[PDB]
mmCIF file of C-alpha atoms and ligand atoms in Angstrom:
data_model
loop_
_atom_site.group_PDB
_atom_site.id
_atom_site.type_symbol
_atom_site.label_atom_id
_atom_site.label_comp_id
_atom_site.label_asym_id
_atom_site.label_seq_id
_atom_site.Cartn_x
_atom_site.Cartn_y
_atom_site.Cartn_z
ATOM 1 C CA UNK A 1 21.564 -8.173 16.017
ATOM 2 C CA UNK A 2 18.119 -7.464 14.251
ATOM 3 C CA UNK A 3 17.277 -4.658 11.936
ATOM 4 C CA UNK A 4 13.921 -3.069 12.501
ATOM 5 C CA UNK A 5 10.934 -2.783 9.956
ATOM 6 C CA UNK A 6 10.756 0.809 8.426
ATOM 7 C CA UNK A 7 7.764 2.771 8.394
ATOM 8 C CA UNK A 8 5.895 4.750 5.647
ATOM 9 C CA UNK A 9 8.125 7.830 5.420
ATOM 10 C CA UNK A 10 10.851 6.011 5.313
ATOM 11 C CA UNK A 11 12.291 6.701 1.347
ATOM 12 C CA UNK A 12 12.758 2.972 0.908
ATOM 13 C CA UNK A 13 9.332 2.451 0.980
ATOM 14 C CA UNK A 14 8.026 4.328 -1.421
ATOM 15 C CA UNK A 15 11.064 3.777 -4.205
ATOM 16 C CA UNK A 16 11.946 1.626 -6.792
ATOM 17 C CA UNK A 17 14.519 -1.020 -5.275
ATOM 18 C CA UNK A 18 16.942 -2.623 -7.512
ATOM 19 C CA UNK A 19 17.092 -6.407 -8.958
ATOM 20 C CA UNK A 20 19.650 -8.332 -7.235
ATOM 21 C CA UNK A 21 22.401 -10.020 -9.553
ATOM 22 C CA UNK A 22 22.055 -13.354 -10.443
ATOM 23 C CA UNK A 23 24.743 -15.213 -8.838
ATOM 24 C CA UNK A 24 25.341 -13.061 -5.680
ATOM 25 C CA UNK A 25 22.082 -14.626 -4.857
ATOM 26 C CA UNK A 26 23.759 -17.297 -3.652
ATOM 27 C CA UNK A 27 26.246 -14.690 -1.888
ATOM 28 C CA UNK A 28 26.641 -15.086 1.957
ATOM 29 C CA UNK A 29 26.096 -11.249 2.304
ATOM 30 C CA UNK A 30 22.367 -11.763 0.711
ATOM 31 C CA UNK A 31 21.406 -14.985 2.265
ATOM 32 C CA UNK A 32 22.158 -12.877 5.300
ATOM 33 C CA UNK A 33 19.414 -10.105 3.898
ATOM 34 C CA UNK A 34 17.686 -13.690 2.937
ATOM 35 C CA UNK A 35 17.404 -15.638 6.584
ATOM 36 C CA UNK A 36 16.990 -11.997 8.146
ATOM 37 C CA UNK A 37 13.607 -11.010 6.276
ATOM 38 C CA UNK A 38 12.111 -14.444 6.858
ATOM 39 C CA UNK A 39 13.053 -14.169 10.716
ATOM 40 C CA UNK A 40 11.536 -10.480 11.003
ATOM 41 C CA UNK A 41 8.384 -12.088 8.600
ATOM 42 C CA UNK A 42 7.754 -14.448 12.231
ATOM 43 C CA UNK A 43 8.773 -12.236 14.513
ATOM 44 C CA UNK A 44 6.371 -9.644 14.596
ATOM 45 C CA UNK A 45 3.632 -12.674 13.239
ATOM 46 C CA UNK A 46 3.119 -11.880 9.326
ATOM 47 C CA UNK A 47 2.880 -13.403 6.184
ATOM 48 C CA UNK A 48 5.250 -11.492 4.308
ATOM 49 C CA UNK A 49 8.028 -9.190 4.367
ATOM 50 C CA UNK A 50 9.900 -7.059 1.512
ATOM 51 C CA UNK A 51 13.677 -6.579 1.558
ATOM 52 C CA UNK A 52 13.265 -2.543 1.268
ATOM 53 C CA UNK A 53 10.651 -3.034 4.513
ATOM 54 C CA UNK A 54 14.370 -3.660 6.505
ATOM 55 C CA UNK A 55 16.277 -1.191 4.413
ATOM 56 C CA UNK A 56 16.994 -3.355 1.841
ATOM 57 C CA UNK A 57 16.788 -1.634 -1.512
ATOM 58 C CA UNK A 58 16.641 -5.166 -3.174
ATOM 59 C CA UNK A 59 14.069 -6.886 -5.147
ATOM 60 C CA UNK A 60 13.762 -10.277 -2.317
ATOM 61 C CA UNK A 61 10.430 -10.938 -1.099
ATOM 62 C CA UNK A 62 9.694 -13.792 1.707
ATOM 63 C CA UNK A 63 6.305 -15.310 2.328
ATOM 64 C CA UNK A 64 4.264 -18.313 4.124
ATOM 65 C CA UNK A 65 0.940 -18.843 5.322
ATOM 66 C CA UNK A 66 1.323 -21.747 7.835
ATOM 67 C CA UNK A 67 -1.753 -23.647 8.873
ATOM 68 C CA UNK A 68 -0.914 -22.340 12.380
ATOM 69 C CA UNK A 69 -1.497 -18.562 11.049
ATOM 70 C CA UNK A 70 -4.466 -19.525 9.465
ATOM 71 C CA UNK A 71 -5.290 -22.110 12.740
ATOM 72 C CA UNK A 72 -7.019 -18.876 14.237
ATOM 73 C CA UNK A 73 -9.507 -17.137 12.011
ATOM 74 C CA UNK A 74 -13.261 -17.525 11.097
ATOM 75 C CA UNK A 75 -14.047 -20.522 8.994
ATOM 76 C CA UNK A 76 -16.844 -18.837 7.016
ATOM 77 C CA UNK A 77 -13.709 -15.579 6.603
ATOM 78 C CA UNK A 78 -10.652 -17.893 5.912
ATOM 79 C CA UNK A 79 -13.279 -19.911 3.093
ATOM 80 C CA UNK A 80 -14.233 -16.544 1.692
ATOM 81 C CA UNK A 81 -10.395 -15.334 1.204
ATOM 82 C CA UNK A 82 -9.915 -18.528 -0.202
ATOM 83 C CA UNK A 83 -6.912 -18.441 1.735
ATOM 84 C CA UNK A 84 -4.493 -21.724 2.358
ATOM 85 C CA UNK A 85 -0.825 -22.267 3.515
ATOM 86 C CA UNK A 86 2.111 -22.735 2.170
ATOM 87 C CA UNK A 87 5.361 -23.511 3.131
ATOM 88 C CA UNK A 88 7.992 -20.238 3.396
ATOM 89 C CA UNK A 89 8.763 -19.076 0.124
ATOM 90 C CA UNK A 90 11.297 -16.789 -1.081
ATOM 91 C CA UNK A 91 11.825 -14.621 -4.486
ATOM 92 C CA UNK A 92 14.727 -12.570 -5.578
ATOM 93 C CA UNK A 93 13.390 -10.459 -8.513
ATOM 94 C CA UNK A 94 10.502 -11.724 -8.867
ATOM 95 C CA UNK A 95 8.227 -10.554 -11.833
ATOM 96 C CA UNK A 96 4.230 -10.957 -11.307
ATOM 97 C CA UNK A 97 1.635 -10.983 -13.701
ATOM 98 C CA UNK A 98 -2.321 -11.884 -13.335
ATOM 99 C CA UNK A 99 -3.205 -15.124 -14.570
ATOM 100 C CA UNK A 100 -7.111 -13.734 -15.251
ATOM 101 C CA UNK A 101 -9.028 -10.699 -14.483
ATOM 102 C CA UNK A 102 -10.738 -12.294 -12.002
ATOM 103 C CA UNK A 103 -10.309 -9.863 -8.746
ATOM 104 C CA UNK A 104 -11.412 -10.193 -4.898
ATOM 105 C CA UNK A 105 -11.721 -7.286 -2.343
ATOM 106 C CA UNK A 106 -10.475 -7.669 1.259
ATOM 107 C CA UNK A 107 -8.604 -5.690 3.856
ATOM 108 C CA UNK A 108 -4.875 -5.748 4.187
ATOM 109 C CA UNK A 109 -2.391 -4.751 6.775
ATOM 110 C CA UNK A 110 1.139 -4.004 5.915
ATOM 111 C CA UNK A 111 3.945 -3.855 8.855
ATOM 112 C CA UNK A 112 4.905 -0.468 8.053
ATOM 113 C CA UNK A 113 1.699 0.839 8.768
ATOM 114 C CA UNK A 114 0.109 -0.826 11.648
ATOM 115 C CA UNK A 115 -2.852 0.066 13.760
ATOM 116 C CA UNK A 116 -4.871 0.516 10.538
ATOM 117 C CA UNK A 117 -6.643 -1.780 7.871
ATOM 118 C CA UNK A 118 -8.271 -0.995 4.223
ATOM 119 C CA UNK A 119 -9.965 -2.417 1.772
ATOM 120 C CA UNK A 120 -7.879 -2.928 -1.542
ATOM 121 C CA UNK A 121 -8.906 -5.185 -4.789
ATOM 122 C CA UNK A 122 -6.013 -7.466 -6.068
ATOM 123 C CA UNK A 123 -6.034 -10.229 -8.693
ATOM 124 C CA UNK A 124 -7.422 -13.451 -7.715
ATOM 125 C CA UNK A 125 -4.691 -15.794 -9.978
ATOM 126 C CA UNK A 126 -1.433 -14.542 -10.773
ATOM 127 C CA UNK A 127 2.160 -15.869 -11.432
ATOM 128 C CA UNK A 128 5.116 -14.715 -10.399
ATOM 129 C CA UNK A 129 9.064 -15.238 -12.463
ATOM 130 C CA UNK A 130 12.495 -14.989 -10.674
ATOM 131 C CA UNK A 131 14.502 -16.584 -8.751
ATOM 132 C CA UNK A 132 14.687 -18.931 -5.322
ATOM 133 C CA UNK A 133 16.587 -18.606 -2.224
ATOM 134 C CA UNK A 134 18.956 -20.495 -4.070
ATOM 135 C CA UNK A 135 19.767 -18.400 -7.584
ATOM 136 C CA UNK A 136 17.819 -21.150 -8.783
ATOM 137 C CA UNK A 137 14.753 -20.058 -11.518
ATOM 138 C CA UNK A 138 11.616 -20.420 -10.592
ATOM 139 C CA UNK A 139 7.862 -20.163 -11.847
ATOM 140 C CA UNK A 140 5.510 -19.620 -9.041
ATOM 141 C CA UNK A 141 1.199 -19.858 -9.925
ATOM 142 C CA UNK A 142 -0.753 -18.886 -7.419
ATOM 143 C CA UNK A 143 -4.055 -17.657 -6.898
ATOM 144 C CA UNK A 144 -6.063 -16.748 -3.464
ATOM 145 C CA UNK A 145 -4.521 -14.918 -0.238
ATOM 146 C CA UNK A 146 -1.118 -16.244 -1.540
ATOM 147 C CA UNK A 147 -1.907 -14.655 -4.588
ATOM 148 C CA UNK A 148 -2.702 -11.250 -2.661
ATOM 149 C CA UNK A 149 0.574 -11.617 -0.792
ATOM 150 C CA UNK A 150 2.729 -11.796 -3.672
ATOM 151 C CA UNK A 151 1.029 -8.205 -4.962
ATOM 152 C CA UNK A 152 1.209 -6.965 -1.714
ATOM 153 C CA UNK A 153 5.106 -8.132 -1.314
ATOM 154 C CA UNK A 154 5.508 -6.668 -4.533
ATOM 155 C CA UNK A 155 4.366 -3.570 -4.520
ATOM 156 C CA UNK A 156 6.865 -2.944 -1.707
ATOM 157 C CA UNK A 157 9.928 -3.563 -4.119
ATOM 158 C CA UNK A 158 8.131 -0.966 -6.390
ATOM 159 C CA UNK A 159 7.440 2.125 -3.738
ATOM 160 C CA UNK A 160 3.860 1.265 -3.410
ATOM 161 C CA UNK A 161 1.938 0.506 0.068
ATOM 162 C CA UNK A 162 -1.615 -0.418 -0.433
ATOM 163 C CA UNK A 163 -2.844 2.894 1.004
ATOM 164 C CA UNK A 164 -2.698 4.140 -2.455
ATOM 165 C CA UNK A 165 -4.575 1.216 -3.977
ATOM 166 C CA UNK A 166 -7.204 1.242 -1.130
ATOM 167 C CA UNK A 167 -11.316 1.917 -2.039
ATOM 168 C CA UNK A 168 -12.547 5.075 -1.107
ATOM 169 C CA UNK A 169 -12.962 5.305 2.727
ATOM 170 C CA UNK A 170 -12.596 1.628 4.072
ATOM 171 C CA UNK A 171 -9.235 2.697 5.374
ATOM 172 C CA UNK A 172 -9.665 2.057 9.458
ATOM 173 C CA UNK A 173 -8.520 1.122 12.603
ATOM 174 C CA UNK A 174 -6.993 -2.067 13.293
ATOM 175 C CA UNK A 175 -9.754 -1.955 16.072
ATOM 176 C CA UNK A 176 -12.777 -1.100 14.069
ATOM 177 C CA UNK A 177 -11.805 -3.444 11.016
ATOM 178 C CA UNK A 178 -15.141 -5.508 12.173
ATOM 179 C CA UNK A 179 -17.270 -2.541 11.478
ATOM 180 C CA UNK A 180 -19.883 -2.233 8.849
ATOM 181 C CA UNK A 181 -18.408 -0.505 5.336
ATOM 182 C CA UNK A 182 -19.884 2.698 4.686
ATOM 183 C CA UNK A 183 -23.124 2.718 2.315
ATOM 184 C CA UNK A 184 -21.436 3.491 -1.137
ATOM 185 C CA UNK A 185 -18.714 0.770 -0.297
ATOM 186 C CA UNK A 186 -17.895 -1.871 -2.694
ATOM 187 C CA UNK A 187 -18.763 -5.192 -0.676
ATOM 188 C CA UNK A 188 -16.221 -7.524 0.092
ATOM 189 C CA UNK A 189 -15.447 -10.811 -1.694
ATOM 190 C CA UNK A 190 -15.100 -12.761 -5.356
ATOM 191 C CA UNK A 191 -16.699 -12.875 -8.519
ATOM 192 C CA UNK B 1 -18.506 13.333 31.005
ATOM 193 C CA UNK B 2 -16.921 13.516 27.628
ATOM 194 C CA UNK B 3 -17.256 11.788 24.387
ATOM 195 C CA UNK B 4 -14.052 10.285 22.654
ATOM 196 C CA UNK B 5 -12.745 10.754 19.497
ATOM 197 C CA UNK B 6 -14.191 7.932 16.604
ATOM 198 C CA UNK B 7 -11.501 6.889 14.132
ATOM 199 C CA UNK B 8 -11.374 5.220 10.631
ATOM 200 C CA UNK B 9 -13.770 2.062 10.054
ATOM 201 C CA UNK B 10 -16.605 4.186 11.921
ATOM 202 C CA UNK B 11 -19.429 4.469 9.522
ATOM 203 C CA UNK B 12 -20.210 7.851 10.567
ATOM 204 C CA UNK B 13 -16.791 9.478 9.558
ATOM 205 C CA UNK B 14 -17.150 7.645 6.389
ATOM 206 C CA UNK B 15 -20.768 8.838 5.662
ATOM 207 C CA UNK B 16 -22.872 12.315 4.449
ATOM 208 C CA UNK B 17 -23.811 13.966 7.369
ATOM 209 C CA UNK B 18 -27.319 15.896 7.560
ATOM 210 C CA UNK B 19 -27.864 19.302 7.565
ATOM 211 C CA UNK B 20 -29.270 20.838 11.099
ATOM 212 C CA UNK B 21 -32.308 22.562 10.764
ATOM 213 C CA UNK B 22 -31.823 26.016 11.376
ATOM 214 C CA UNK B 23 -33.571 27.539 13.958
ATOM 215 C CA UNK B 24 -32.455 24.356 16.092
ATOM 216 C CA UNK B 25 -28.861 26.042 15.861
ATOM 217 C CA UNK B 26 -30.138 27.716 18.810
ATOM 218 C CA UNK B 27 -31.638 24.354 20.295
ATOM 219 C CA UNK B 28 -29.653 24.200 23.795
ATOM 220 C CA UNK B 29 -28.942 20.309 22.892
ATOM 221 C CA UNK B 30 -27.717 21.268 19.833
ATOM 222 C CA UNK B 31 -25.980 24.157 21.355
ATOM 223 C CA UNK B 32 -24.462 21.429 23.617
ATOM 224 C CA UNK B 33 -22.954 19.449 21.036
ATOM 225 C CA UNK B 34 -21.318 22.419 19.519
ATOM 226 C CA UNK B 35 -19.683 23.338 22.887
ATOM 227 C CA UNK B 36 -18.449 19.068 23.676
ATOM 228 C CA UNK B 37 -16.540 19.596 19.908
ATOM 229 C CA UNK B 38 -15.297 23.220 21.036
ATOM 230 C CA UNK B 39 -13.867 21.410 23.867
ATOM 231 C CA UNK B 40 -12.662 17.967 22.132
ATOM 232 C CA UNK B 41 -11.033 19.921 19.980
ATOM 233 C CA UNK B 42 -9.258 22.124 22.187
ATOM 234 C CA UNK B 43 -8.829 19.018 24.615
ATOM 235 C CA UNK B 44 -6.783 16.529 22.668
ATOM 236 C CA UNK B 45 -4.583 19.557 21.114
ATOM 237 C CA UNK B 46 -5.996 20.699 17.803
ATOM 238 C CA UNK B 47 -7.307 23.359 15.211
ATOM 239 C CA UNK B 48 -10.354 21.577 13.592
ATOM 240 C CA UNK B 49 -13.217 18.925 14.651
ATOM 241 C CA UNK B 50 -16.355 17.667 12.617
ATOM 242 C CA UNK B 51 -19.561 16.525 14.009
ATOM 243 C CA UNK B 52 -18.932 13.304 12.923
ATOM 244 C CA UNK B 53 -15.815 12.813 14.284
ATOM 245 C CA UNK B 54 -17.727 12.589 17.702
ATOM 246 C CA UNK B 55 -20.481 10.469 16.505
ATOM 247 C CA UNK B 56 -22.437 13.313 15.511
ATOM 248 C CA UNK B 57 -24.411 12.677 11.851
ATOM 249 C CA UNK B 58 -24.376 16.553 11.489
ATOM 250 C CA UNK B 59 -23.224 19.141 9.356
ATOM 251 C CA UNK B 60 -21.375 21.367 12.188
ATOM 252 C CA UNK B 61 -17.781 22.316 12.417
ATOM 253 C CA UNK B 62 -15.814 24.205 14.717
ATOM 254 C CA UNK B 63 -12.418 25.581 14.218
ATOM 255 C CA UNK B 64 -9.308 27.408 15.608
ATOM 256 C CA UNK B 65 -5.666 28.752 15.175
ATOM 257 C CA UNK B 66 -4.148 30.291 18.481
ATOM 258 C CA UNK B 67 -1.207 32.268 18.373
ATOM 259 C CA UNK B 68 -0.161 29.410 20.820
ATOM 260 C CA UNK B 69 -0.654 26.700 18.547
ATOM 261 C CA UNK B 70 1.172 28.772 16.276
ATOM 262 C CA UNK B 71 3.318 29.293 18.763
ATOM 263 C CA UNK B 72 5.961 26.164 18.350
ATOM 264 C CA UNK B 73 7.006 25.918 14.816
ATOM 265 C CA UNK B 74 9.402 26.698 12.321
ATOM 266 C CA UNK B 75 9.027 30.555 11.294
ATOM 267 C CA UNK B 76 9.809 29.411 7.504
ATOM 268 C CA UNK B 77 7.559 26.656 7.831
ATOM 269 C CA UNK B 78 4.723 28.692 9.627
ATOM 270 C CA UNK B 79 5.549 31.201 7.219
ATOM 271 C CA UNK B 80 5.118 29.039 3.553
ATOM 272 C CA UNK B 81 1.825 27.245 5.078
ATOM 273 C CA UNK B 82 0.977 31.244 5.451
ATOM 274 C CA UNK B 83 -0.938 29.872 8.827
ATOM 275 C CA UNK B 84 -2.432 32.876 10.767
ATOM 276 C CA UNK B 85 -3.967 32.783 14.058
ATOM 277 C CA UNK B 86 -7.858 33.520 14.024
ATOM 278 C CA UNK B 87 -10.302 33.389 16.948
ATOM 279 C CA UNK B 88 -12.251 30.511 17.403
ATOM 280 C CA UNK B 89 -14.962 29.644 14.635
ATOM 281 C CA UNK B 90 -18.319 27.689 14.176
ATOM 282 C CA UNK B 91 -19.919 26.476 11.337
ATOM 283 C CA UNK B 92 -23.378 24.851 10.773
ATOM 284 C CA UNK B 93 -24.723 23.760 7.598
ATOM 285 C CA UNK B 94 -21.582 25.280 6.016
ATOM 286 C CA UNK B 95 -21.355 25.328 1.722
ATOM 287 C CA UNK B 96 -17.396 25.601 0.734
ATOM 288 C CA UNK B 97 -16.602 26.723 -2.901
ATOM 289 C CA UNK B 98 -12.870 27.288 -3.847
ATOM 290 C CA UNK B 99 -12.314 31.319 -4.578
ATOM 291 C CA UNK B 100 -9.516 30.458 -7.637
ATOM 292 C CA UNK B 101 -7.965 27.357 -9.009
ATOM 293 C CA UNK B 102 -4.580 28.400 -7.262
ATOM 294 C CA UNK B 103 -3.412 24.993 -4.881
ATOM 295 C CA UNK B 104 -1.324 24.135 -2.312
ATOM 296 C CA UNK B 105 0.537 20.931 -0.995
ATOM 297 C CA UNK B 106 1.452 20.373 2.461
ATOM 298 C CA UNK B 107 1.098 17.456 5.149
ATOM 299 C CA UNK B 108 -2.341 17.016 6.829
ATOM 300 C CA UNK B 109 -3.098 14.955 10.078
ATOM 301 C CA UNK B 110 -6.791 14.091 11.447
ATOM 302 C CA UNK B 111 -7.447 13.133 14.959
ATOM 303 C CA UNK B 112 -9.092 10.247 13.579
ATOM 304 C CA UNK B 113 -5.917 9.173 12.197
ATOM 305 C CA UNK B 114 -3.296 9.804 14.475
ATOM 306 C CA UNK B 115 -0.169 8.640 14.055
ATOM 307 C CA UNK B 116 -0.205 9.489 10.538
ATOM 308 C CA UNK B 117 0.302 12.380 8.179
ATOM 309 C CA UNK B 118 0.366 12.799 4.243
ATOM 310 C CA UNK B 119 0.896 15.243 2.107
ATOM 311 C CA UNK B 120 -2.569 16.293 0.246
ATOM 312 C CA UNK B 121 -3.177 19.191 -1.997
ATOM 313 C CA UNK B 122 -6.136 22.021 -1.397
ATOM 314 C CA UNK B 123 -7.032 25.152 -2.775
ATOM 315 C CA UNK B 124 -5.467 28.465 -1.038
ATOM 316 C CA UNK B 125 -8.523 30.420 -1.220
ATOM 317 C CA UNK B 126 -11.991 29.216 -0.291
ATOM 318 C CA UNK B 127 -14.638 30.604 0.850
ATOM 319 C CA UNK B 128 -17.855 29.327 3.089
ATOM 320 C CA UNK B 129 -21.374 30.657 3.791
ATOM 321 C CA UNK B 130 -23.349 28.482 6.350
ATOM 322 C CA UNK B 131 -25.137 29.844 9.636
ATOM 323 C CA UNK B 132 -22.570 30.604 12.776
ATOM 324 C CA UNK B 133 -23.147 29.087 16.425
ATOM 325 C CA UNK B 134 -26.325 31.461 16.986
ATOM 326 C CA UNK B 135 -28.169 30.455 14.055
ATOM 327 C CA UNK B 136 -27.311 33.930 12.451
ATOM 328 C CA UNK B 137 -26.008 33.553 8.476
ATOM 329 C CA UNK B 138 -22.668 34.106 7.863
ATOM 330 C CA UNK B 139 -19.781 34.183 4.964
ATOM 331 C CA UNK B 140 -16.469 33.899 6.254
ATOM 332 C CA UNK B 141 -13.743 33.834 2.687
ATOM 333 C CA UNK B 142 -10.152 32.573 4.089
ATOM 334 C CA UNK B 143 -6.785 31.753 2.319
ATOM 335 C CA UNK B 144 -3.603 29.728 3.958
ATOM 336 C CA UNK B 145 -3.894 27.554 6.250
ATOM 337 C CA UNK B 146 -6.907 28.283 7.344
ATOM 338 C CA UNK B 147 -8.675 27.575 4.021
ATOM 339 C CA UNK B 148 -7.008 24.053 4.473
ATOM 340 C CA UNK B 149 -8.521 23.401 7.791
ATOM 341 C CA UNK B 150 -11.815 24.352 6.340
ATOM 342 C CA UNK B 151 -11.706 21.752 3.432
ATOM 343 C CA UNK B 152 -10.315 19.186 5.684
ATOM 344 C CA UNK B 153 -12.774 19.686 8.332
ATOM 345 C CA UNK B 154 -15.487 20.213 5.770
ATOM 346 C CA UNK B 155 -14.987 17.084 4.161
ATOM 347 C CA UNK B 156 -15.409 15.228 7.135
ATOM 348 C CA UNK B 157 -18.908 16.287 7.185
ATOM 349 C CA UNK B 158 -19.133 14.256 3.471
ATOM 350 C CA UNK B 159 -17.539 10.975 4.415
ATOM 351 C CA UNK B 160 -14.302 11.856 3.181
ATOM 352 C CA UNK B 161 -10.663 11.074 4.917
ATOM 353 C CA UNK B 162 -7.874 13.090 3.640
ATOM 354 C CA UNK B 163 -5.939 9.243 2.786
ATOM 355 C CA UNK B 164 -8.211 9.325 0.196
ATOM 356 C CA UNK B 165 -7.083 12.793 -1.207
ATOM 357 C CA UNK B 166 -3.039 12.443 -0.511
ATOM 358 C CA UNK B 167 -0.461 12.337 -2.954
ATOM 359 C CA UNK B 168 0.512 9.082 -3.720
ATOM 360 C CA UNK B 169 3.286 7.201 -1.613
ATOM 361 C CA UNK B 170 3.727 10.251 0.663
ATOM 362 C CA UNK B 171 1.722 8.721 3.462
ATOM 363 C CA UNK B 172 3.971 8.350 6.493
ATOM 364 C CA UNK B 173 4.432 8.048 10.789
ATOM 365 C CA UNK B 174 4.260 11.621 12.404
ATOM 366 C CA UNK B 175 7.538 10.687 13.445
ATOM 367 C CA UNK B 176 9.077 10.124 10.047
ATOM 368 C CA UNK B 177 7.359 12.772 8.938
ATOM 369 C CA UNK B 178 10.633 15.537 8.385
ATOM 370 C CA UNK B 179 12.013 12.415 6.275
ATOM 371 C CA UNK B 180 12.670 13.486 2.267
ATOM 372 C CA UNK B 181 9.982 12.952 0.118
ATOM 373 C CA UNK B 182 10.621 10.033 -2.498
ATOM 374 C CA UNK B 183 11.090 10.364 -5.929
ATOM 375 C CA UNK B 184 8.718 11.618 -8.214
ATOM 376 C CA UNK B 185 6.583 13.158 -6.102
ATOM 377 C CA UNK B 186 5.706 16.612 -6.127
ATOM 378 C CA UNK B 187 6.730 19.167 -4.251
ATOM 379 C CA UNK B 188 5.460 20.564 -0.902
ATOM 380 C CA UNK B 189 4.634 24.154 -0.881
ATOM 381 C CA UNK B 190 2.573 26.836 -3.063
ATOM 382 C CA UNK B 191 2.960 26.819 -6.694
HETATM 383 ZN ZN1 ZN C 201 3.520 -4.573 3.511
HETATM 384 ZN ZN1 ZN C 202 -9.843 15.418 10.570
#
């Protein structure tokens, strides 16, 4: 049976979840928690999905941008976002940390708040510690949309939803995300 | 025929709106567009309404608290908001100025955000001159929740959302809205 994705309200969301232990990683009872967030991640069609969004008060994030996902989106929007796919990916206690000071503004979407879109600035090269699906160390460098997914993801397993890292009024309906920015508005994009 | 509701993303929630000349306050089409908000706002169930919030670039806002409204909810909670019924109110050109530093934190909701609510703080006593629906000048000094409405609806009429004013991570789904606040965040009520 499936558990459901939380909402903001929810107290998981917005707290600190706790670092799973080394070596239960490989558990059963996690790789449960494991195969369950990266089946919710496709369900309802995202790109990634934090344990405490299923009211899992762990430190697992799951994420992949598949060429299909990206398949339907504007060429000139996809090139802009620098964004590319990569296969499913999963982190237990992962531990990010930008790369450069380079940053990018775009909107974001988060499951737990749907129906609405906001601009929010993240890093444009980052790498992230921690371990694999397996207990196994790992060293992921990324840098692009897969870099903004690992913030995003992050944030999650810290209490944080991008609605308090948003710019000033860009906040909107899923609906109106094509609308023009206010005057006074950042604009969107790189350095 | 009756004009809808715009939500986030709309450029003119998210932008100054002007000032209307006085002396047109009594301009029937004018007059008109105070009357569609009187009714928006009593149509979709509510106690404020900017221009804006009906495509209207103008500095008007209209505002009530029926005992009705009032009418269905908690007598401790009704009673800590200190929210008090007062006839229906209209407001063009209006200037708001806190009375006193003294604050308050409770959730807010907009109509252009439904769905939603979050807890944002605002001063207890305000108070705002401006002209009233017959071009006449008036004063009006409030406390409770009535000063709230005024800064919320207020603010509209300068681009600004109340997501952009909430305590951080406190953001949540009407329905999960009764759910405990998460740690580290302050509490609700006056101080
Ligand atoms: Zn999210
Ligand atoms: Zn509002």
């Amino acid at each position: 049976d499936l558990p459901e994705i939380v909402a903001s309200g929810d107290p998981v969301l917005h707290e600190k979840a706790r670092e799973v232990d080394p070596g239960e990683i490989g558990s059963e009872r996690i790789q449960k928690i494991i195969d369950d967030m990266i089946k919710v991640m496709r369900l309802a069609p995202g790109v990634g999905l934090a344990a405490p969004q299923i009211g899992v008060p762990l430190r697992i994030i799951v994420l992949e941008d598949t060429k299909e996902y990206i398949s339907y989106a504007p060429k000139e929007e996809i090139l802009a976002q620098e964004r590319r796919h990569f296969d499913l990916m999963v982190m237990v206690n992962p531990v990010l940390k930008e790369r450069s000071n380079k940053k990018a503004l775009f909107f974001e979407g988060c499951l737990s708040v749907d129906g609405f879109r906001a601009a929010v600035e993240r890093y444009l090269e980052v790498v992230v510690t921690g371990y694999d699906r397996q207990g196994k160390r790992i060293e992921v460098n990324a840098s692009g949309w897969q870099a903004r997914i690992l913030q995003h993801e992050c944030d999650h397993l810290d209490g944080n939803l991008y609605v308090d890292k948003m710019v000033p009024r860009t906040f909107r309906t899923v609906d109106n995300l094509d609308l023009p920015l206010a005057e006074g508005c950042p604009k969107l994009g790189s350095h």
